[PDB]
Amino acid sequence: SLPFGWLIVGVALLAVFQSASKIITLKKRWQLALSKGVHFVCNLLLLFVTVYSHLLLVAAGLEAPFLYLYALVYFLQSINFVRIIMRLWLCWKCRSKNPLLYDANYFLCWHTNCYDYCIPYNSVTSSIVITSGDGEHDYQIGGYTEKWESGVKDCVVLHSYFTSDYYQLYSTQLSTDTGVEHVTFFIYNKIVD
């Protein structure tokens, strides 16, 4: 027999981890990794309590008025598994772990010999501005920051699960152009074909 108390223990642990996941600030990279790990543990606990309660129902014999609900859970969890696979493939394509750390719809990426840049971005726009601050020395879009390791490229690429859009560097705004000291603005126009 399957005792009922493991369902309560699983519910209590799931509540602990879900409540903790609700209140982790997403500012530093270690906090992002912590939040992703806690969400992974939450999903594992949710799978446990779902499967275990379904087993309790089956051992009781009252599963039949819940087949549609449990099938719905398993279908949505299969979709989530496919989504996690696509996120890992986005990490492979971006040559970065940032798609795992960030929930953004898009990632602006470019390749240098010593670093692969991958910055979160929300939508496909006709232009993209990369802000570069010197000495930390960093690239920044939308308040998202990557440490400077090398120069800009003439072409950057916005990646999603299914799309890739290329951007060509059109203009470089210096402090004499803008008045903002110690800051450069690289302006990219979307390539249309």
140 in Cβ contact with 122 (< 8 Å): no
Binding mask 77-96 for other proteins (x = CB under 8 A): -----x---x--x-------
97 CB-near residues (< 8 Å, 6+ apart): 91
Q: CB 73 → other proteins: shortest distance, Å?
A: 19
Per CB under 8 A, contacts with other proteins among 17-36 are 25, 27-28, 30-31
Site for its own copies contains 97 (CB under 8 A)? no
Distance CA 133, CA 181 (A): 9
Is 123 near its own copies (CB under 8 A)? yes
Q: In the stretch 160-179, what mask flags binding to other proteins with x, by CB under 8 A? A: -xxx----------------
Q: Does 86 bind its own copies (CB under 8 A)?
A: no
Residue 91 neighbours by CB under 8 Å, 6+ apart: 97, 98, 99, 100
Q: Residue 31 binds which entry of other proteins, its own copies, none, with Cβ cut-offs from 5 to 8 Å by kind?
A: other proteins
Tell me which H or E stretch contains 14. Answer: helix 5-21
Instruction: Choose from other proteins, its own copies, none: what does 28 bind? Cβ within 5-8 Å by kind.
Output: other proteins
- Report the distance separating Cα 42 and Cα 10, nearest Å: 10
CA distance 108 to 142: 11
Nearer to other proteins, 25 or 123 (CB): 25
Q: Of 146, 38, 145, 159, whose CA–CA distance to 89 is shortest?
A: 159
- Segment contacting other proteins by CB under 8 A, of 54-62, 98-106, 156-164, 180-188: 156-164
Mind giving me the DSSP string for 112-123? -SS-EEEEEE-S
What H or E segment, with its residue span, contains residue 45?
helix 29-60
Q: Which is nearer to other proteins, 163 or 171 (CB)?
A: 163
Side chain identity, residue 193: D
| CB-based contact 13:45 (threshold 8 Å) | yes
Per CB under 8 A, residues contacting other proteins are 25, 27-28, 30-31, 82, 86, 89, 161-163
Per CB under 8 A, residues contacting its own copies are 4-5, 7-9, 11-16, 18-20, 22-23, 25-27, 43, 46, 49-50, 53, 56-57, 62, 66, 69-70, 72-73, 76-77, 79-80, 83, 103, 105-106, 120-127, 129, 131, 133, 140-145, 170-171, 173, 177-180, 182-183, 185, 187, 189
